[PDB]
Amino acid sequence: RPTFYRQELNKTIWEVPERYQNLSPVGSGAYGSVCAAFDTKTGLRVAVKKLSRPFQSIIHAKRTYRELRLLKHMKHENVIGLLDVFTPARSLEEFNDVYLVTHLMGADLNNIVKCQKLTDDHVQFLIYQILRGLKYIHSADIIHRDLKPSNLAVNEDCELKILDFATRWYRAPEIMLNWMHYNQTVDIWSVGCIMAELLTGRTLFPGTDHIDQLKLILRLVGTPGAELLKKISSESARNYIQSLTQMPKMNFANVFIGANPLAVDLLEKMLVLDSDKRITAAQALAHAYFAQYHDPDDEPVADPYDQSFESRDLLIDEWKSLTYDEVISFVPPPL
Numbered sequence: 001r002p003t004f005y006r007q008e009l010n011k012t013i014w015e016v017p018e019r020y021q022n023l024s025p026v027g028s029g030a031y032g033s034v035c036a037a038f039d040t041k042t043g044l045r046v047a048v049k050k051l052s053r054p055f056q057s058i059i060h061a062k063r064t065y066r067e068l069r070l071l072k073h074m075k076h077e078n079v080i081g082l083l084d085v086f087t088p089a090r091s092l093e094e095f096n097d098v099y100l101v102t103h104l105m106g107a108d109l110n111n112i113v114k115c116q117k118l119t120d121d122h123v124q125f126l127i128y129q130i131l132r133g134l135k136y137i138h139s140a141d142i143i144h145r146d147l148k149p150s151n152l153a154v155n156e157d158c159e160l161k162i163l164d165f166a167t168r169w170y171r172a173p174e175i176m177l178n179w180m181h182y183n184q185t186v187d188i189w190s191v192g193c194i195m196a197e198l199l200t201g202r203t204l205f206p207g208t209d210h211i212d213q214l215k216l217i218l219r220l221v222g223t224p225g226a227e228l229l230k231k232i233s234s235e236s237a238r239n240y241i242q243s244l245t246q247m248p249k250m251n252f253a254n255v256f257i258g259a260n261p262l263a264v265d266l267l268e269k270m271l272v273l274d275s276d277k278r279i280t281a282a283q284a285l286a287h288a289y290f291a292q293y294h295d296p297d298d299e300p301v302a303d304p305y306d307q308s309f310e311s312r313d314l315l316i317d318e319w320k321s322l323t324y325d326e327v328i329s330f331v332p333p334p335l
C-alpha cells in the first residue's frame with residue numbers, strides 16, 4: 001500500500017498516493033473532477049479523475065462499476081486507458097472514493113476546430129485515429145453512443161484518444177426517432193458529422209431541438225426510401241415520416257464543394273440514412289481517403305468483453321463491493 005496525503009482544491013477534497021505530485025485542477029463536469037499531476041514513478045504528467053458521488057444510488061453505483069470495467073478493458077492507442085486506479089480506503093467498509101489515472105491530454109477536438117481551420121491532411125489523420133479506435137471498441141461489442149468533438153482528446157502531437165466510451169448535433173437519426181434497436185453504426189454517423197465539421201469549419205446539423213435536428217438531416221440525405229420505410233416498425237414514426245413532405249438526397253459534391261473528392265465519397269458512405277447501409281469502422285479504414293495511414297496489420301481488435309452484468313439487478317452494496325474487487329485486482333500496464 002502506498003502512502004497517501006490529503007489536500008483540498010476547488011472545494012473538492014483529494015487524497016492520493018504520494019507518487020502523484022503537483023495536483024492542479026484541469027476541468028470538472030457532471031462525471032467528476034480532473035486534476036493534472038506529475039507522476040514521480042514514471043515521470044509522466046497525468047490526469048487524475050475523482051469520481052463524484054460514486055455510490056449515491058444504484059444508478060450511480062452501477063455506472064461506477066461499468067466505467068471501471070470498461071476502462072480496465074480498453075488497451076488501445078486511440079482509446080483512453082487506465083494507468084492506475086486507487087482508493088484511500090483500506091477496507092471495503094470505509095470504501096467510498098474512486099480515483100482514475102490516465103495520460104494527461106492537452107485539448108479536445110472542439111478546442112482545435114474552433115481555434116483554427118484544418119487542412120485536408122490533418123482531417124485524414126484525425127479521422128483515421130477515431131476510426132482506428134472505433135474499430136477496436138466495436139470489435140468488443142461496445143457502442144460509444146455519444147461521439148462528438150468534445151469527447152476526443154488530442155495533444156500537441158495531434159495524437160487522438162476516444163473518451164467516455166449539444167450532443168444532439170452528432171446523434172444518428174434513428175436515435176432522434178427513438179429506434180429501440182440501433183447498432184454500432186450510430187457511431188459511424190457521428191464520425192461523419194465530425195469529419196464534415198473539420199472540413200467545412202461549420203456544424204453540419206445545428207438543430208435547435210430533436211424535431212429540427214431531424215429536419216436538417218433529411219434536408220441533406222433525403223427522406224427515407226421505400227426500402228428503409230419497410231424497416232420501420234413503430235407505427236407512429238412510420239406515420240410521421242410518411243406524412244412529411246418528400247425531400248431528395250442532395251449531391252454532397254455540391255454541398256462540400258472544394259473538399260477532397262475522396263473525403264466527399266467517404267462522407268456519402270457514412271451519412272447514409274439507412275443504418276444497415278452505412279460503412280463500418282473496419283471498412284472505412286480501408287477507404288482510399290486514408291491510403292497514407294491505413295495499415296491492415298496495425299489496426300487491432302479487442303479481447304472479448306463480458307457485458308452480462310448490465311442486465312443484473314443488485315443492491316448498491318453489491319455494486320459497491322464489485323467495484324472494490326475491480327479496484328483491488330487492477331494490474332498496471334507494462335511501463
Ligand SMILES: c1ccc2cc(-c3nnc(N4CCNCC4)cc3-c3ccncc3)ccc2c1
Nearest residue numbers: 034047048049100101102103104105108150151
Ligand atoms: C482515467 C481514465 C479516464 C480519464 C478521463 C479524463 C477526462 N475526462 N473527460 C474529459 N473531458 C474532455 C472535455 N469534454 C468531455 C470531458 C477530459 C479528460 C482528460 C483526460 C486526459 N487529460 C486531460 C483530460 C480524465 C482523467 C481520466 C483518468
Ligand SMILES: Fc1ccc(-c2n[nH]cc2-c2ccncc2)cc1
Nearest residue numbers: 173174179224231232233273274275
Ligand atoms: F427518418 C428516418 C431516419 C432514420 C431511419 C433509420 N435509419 N436506420 C434505421 C432506421 C430506423 C428508424 C426507426 N425504426 C427503424 C429503423 C429511419 C427513418
Ligand SMILES: Fc1ccc(-c2n[nH]cc2-c2ccncc2)cc1
Nearest residue numbers: 176177178211236237239240241243
Ligand atoms: F418521434 C416522433 C413521434 C411522433 C411524431 C409525430 N407524429 N405525428 C405528428 C408528429 C409530430 C410530433 C412533434 N412535432 C411535430 C410533429 C413525431 C416524432
Ligand SMILES: [Zn+2]
Nearest residue numbers: 056057059060
Ligand atoms: Zn446522478
